[PDB]
From a paper:
In this work, the structural and functional characterization of PnpA, an [name]/[name] family peptidase secreted by Photobacterium damselae subsp. piscicida (Phdp) is reported. The results show that PnpA is a PG hydrolase with a four-domain structure similar to that of Desulfovibrio vulgaris lysin (DvLysin) and specificity for the γ-d-glutamyl-meso-diaminopimelic acid bond, but with a more hydrophobic and narrower access to the catalytic center. It is also shown that PnpA is secreted into the extracellular medium by the Phdp type II secretion system and acts on the PG of Vibrio anguillarum and Vibrio vulnificus, suggesting that it may provide Phdp an advantage over bacteria competing for the same resources or a way of obtaining nutrients in nutrient-scarce environments, either inside or outside the host. PnpA is not essential for Phdp cell wall biogenesis and does not cleave Phdp PG, but it degrades the PG of V. anguillarum and V. vulnificus, two bacterial species that share the same hosts and/or environment as Phdp.
The crystal asymmetric unit contains two PnpA molecules, which are essentially identical (root mean square deviation [RMSD], of 0.5 Å for 457 aligned Cα atoms). Analysis of the intermolecular packing interfaces within the crystal lattice suggests that the molecule behaves as a monomer in solution, which is in agreement with the molecular mass estimated by size exclusion chromatography. The PnpA monomer has an overall structure similar to that of DvLysin, namely, one N-terminal “c-clip” or “N_[name]_[name]” stabilizing domain (residues N20-N133), two SH3b domains (SH3b1, residues I134-V218; SH3b2, residues D219-T295), and the C-terminal [name]/[name] catalytic domain (residues P296-K499). As in DvLysin, the PnpA c-clip domain has an extended helical conformation which surrounds and stabilizes the SH3b1 and [name]/[name] domains, forming a planar assembly from which the SH3b2 domain protrudes. Compared to DvLysin, the c-clip domain of PnpA harbors an extension between helices α1 and α2, thereby forming an additional two-stranded antiparallel β-sheet (β2 and β3) and a 310 helix (η4), which protrude into the catalytic groove and close one of its sides. While this topology is generally maintained in PnpA, the end of the groove opposite to the RT loop is also closed by strands β2 and β3 and the 310 helix η4, creating a narrower access to the catalytic site. In PnpA, the residues that make up the active site are C324, H395, and N415, the latter similar to the equivalent residue found in the active site of the prototypical papain, but differing from the histidine (H408) at the active site of DvLysin. In the PnpA structure, the thiol group of the catalytic cysteine is oxidized, resulting in the disruption of the characteristic C324 SD-H395 ND1 hydrogen bond and suggesting that the enzyme is in an inactive state.
Author numbering: 21 to 477
The structure:
């Protein structure tokens, strides 16, 4: 082998993990969701605020522990790939100079080259966009025969941003085909055709509309008589609605956004934020199960942290983009680095802990050192599995690490969003060991943390 599939372990229905008496309840109360929704609006609209600028980028808006100089990050990214060999989108070795043409097109000597007088660089996403660390659709893969490498691990791929996302326009490539933007806690390059600037009137009118959000993962927007293409509406989008018809921003001939009314008779959406009931969380969780794992949002399929950010956005609860920032900045992190497997299971299974964990409101994160994270999921409580009570989580994992007798690595592949035991694949440890593969249990991760969400920053 090397990459070895493992079966799905537990029932793929969030309602299996919700007691009947909780069905009709909300997970958090009115006061708490109001505070979370206010925080969401501050973070989500930060690029339209007077506080934001074209030089500084925050993984968590207004938290200066997360502040970065954009030009430095751009130069760091160029340097990172100039210094490396890898493989392209067709699995062919990159030419030795392939970054040079990209660096030229980035034209950083003119940074930032999009003027911003009267806040004219405020903008919006008009087509769902794959945010890229460099302005190229070409990939950077490590050797695709190495477990954990090849597709979907294109390291240029950073995030998936949905139509409607408030952004700021920073800098345009020399060929004008790419624009460097920031929004939703992400910085990077997108096709220029996927974004548009917005004017003061656009923002004023945006704030007067009722907003809606889709209730299914993907759906097709109507193709009108003169449309050239179908458009896909993705869960997580937040868009105006008037008289029951969705409005979507489209790029006008002058490059600015204007709202277009969509014929909405067959569309599936609801007023945003969605009510944070156990029922609604269950429906939304169920809609993501089976979505392929997409590193960095590759091909509009989410990764571990992107899945959670997306789910919570439907409810007006804001998480940062990546697992480390979620674990450390969505709440007060509790590190179990100094605690044994037995102690970790005592907390998550029996709730024997110094703290109280909350199903559907606690992130569990895992990593290879005390402070780093390489996986995250949403704690969902416990279930009976193989006549044992096990802790469970909603998550998007790629695969669990395996090691053979020669200390070579492998993966027990999952590759899709699922509800899983915390110890993904632990049930298969004995069978794997008989074929000389030792599964590295998530319960034994060097870094292992819980973060409650119920405290808004
Ligand atoms: Cl920012
Ligand atoms: Cl994403
Ligand atoms: Cl487990």
């Amino acid at each position: 082998g090397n990459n070895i599939t493992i079966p799905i372990e537990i029932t793929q229905d969030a309602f299996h993990y919700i007691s009947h008496k909780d069905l009709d309840k909300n997970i958090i109360d009115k006061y708490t969701i109001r505070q979370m929704n206010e925080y969401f609006n501050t973070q989500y609209y930060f690029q339209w605020s007077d506080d934001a600028n074209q030089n500084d980028f925050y993984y968590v808006p207004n938290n200066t522990q997360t502040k970065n100089n954009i030009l430095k990050l751009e130069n760091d990214t160029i340097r990172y790939y100039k210094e490396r060999s890898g493989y392209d989108k067709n699995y062919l070795p990159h030419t030795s100079n392939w970054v040079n043409s990209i660096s030229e097109n980035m034209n950083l000597k003119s940074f930032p080259n999009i003027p911003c007088d009267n806040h004219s660089c405020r903008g919006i996403v008009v087509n769902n966009a794959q945010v890229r660390s460099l302005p190229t659709s070409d990939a950077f893969y490590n050797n695709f025969t190495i477990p954990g490498e090849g597709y979907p691990f294109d390291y240029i791929q950073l995030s998936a941003l949905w139509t409607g996302t408030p952004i700021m326009l920073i800098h345009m490539s020399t060929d004008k085909k790419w624009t460097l933007i920031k929004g939703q806690g992400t910085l990077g390059w997108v096709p220029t055709s996927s974004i548009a600037n917005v004017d003061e009137s656009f923002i004023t009118q945006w704030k007067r509309y009722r907003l809606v959000t889709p209730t299914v993962r993907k759906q097709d927007l109507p193709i009108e008589k003169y449309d050239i293409n179908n458009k896909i509406l993705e869960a997580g989008s937040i868009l105006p609605e008037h008289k029951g018809k969705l409005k979507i921003p489209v790029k006008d001939k002058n490059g600015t956004a204007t709202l277009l009314t969509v014929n909405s008779k067959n569309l599936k959406f609801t007023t945003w934020p969605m009510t944070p009931s156990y029922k609604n969380f269950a429906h939304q969780i169920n809609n993501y199960i089976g979505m392929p794992y997409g590193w960095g949002g590759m091909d509009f399929n989410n990764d571990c942290s992107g899945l959670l950010k997306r789910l919570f956005s439907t409810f007006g609860i804001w998480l940062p983009r990546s697992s480390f920032y979620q674990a450390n900045y969505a709440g007060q992190i509790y590190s179990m680095y100094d605690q044994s497997e037995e102690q970790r299971k005592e907390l998550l299974v029996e709730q024997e802990g110094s703290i109280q964990l909350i199903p559907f409101m606690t992130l569990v994160s895992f990593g290879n050192s005390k402070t780093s994270t390489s996986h995250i999921g949403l704690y969902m409580g416990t279930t009976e599995y193989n006549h044992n009570k096990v802790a469970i989580m909603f998550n998007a994992p790629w695969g669990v690490k395996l090691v053979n007798g020669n200390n070579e690595q492998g993966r027990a592949l999952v590759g899709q969003t699922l509800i899983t035991p915390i110890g993904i694949g632990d049930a298969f440890t004995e069978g794997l060991s008989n074929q000389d593969w030792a599964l590295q249990s998530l319960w034994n991760a060097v870094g292992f943390n819980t973060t409650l969400l119920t405290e808004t920053p």
